[PDB]
Amino acid sequence: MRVLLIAGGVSPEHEVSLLSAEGVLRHIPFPTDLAVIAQDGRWLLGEKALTALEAKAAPEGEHPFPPPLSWERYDVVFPLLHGRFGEDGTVQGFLELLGKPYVGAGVAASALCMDKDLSKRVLAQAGVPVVPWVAVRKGEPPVVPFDPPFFVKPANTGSSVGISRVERFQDLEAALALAFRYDEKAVVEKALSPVRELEVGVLGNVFGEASPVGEVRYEAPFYDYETKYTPGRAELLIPAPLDPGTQETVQELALKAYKVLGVRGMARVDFFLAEGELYLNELNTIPGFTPTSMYPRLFEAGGVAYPELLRRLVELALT
Amino acid sequence: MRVLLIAGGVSPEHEVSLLSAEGVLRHIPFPTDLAVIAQDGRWLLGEKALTALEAKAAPEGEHPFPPPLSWERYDVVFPLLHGRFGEDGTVQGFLELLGKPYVGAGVAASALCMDKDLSKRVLAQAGVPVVPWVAVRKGEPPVVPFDPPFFVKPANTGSSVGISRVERFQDLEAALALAFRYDEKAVVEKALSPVRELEVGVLGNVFGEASPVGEVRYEAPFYDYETKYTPGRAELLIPAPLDPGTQETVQELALKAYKVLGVRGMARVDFFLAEGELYLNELNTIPGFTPTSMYPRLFEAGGVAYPELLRRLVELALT
């Protein structure tokens, strides 16, 4: 069994993807070769891909897309590209046409779970509680049916890039412009204060197996990029310090969401606990595997070690 | 300015796609080259592609994916591949990574408008009226919470392929077995009897401009494959014989749906009219351009002639 790991990407999470690649390459129980997509869209192969991993960033690539790599010597392809052009169905689409079995969600599921507006629309219709929001397009005046504090985010982000905590209605125009630098569409959600952040991992093809619920606590305005990746800043509490009844309800809503969206392989479902009420934030089809990441730590506490978790992903790709 | 038209495909609409290629190549005001994807998934380039167009169908191709095509020679790519692996975001995904401007909806919108379940879920949440429906996964037993007649369809279909009008529950199993030949997911919708079919074309990126409403009349059990593609069977009444406020509601609902799903370039939005109530059937991101297709005819009634429609489409790809 030979696996091809693709990491990097043109998205703002390029550096996160490379850190995720370190975590996967060190624990994958199968012979694996790395391929890096540099920030300019061009690929780096072989030894140049491994050298880019040591630098934690790869700005320039060698090979223009489609890369002259031998796809036939790989049984499974593992796309570990977070964000736009990687987790949104584009690379999955290319892999579908190539006929190569791949890890993770398909085209539709990847495209849906990456669009914060559309994913919430599907979830709300399925009877899953979501935070009340409104979608704002670029060049269109902001019509918000609710009062501040807000949470302005680009519809396609990850790693809290372009996300702002808006307190006044005056600060909305400036936060939307920051959001519009990464996407043509943005969401304006209602901020929950105080809030406990619950995260659960899922494994399986459509009908999943849930991991124990975990909690994230911090000393920052919100769970931002700095808090997410700089060591020791975030408090990863596995298992989550709450009532065993609401711990079961988190797992049930996660598995229900997974099935509705038709997700394959994996996902880490983020939740919000605000005054007894549970709300679903988002689903991430290609979650992080960085040293401070939640997904592999959740399954480690569930009796499923790091080499076993990655082995199960490769097996789900083939089935 | 040179356009690459991609037609054919591995989907059951392969033949319909080649007919659409004949329609676009005859009216497009730019020098255009054709690339054909054969039924086996292999590509036909240059002269072999133009010969495939005269033969009604291309069972076998020459080049495996990715094709050794000179992409740099083209400014805009026009994917005219109806159905699975063409209209679902897969080909759009490849084109995105290629850095190639292309006609029509992006990955997300293409995947959503192709899935008869997910599109209706997103639309129903947005407040757009849709027919009562249920989704059924392969192997799983159906649960239909409404009375017969039904319309059973493969979730990723086009050109009425695999669609059955079910009268008794004794016939549900056979209809689902037919539907499961084309997809791993099927939809069972409540059949509207009697029903009037309204179609409206949309042109533009996200905020589109609607064409006048057209009504389809025919003498067959439903608007099936042979009624759709045999000359003279499907009559188009343009402008549709509707009430003053109803013609406006159809256009407004189409533009609302188009904006929500974030569709780019084009879409033909199909509706149903039963007992004074309007229902959105589906959006088609790559509608047909065959001699019996409704999309170009919907626009020529709105002052946008065939060469101008295609000019707008190629131009919108660069906007």
Ligand SMILES: Nc1ncnc2c1ncn2[C@@H]1O[C@H](COP(=O)(O)OP(=O)(O)OP(=O)(O)O)[C@@H](O)[C@H]1O
């Ligand atoms: N409606 C809200 N109420 C309270 N806090 C919020 C809300 N929305 C976002 N946040 C805060 O901002 C962060 C953004 O998380 P989100 O999952 O929305 O960003 P992401 O970049 O999509 O997350 P990931 O990095 O897991 O993809 C949350 O972790 C939370 O701390």
Ligand SMILES: Nc1ncnc2c1ncn2[C@@H]1O[C@H](COP(=O)(O)OP(=O)(O)OP(=O)(O)O)[C@@H](O)[C@H]1O
């Ligand atoms: N719920 C329904 N009630 C009544 N008739 C229906 C219903 N659903 C489908 N039909 C009939 O079946 C036809 C095809 O359904 P649909 O429009 O969903 O097929 P399609 O293959 O998706 O159409 P296209 O060829 O435009 O893609 C309709 O035009 C209509 O005549």
